[PDB]
């Protein structure tokens, strides 16, 4: 149960990072996005 | 503990799906978006 | 193992918070965003 826990919460990590990179690319337009 | 975590972390993956639907049609322009 | 999974879910909703504060933003117009 824990260890299957870890993998689900590193996963939202990952997609949480991916998605502060492309809000951030939105608020600051980088590279015109 | 354990369970309540699990609906904590199911409760993310809702958060992040919805916040990853919301930066895709920003991204793209879907339906005028 | 179980205090440290804790740390990391809070964390996270912390950090899917501020991207839906963020996003809401962009979606809305807010302030001119």
Same mark, same amino acid.
């Given at each position: $149960? @824990? !260890?299957? =826990?870890? #993998?689900? @919460? !590193? &996963? =939202?990590? =990952? #997609? @949480?990072? &991916?998605? $502060? #990179? #492309? @809000? !951030?690319?939105? $608020?600051?337009?980088?590279?015109?996005?």
């Amino acid at each position: $149960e @824990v !260890e299957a =826990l870890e #993998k689900k @919460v !590193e &996963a =939202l990590e =990952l #997609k @949480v990072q &991916a998605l $502060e #990179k #492309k @809000v !951030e690319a939105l $608020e600051h337009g980088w590279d015109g996005r």
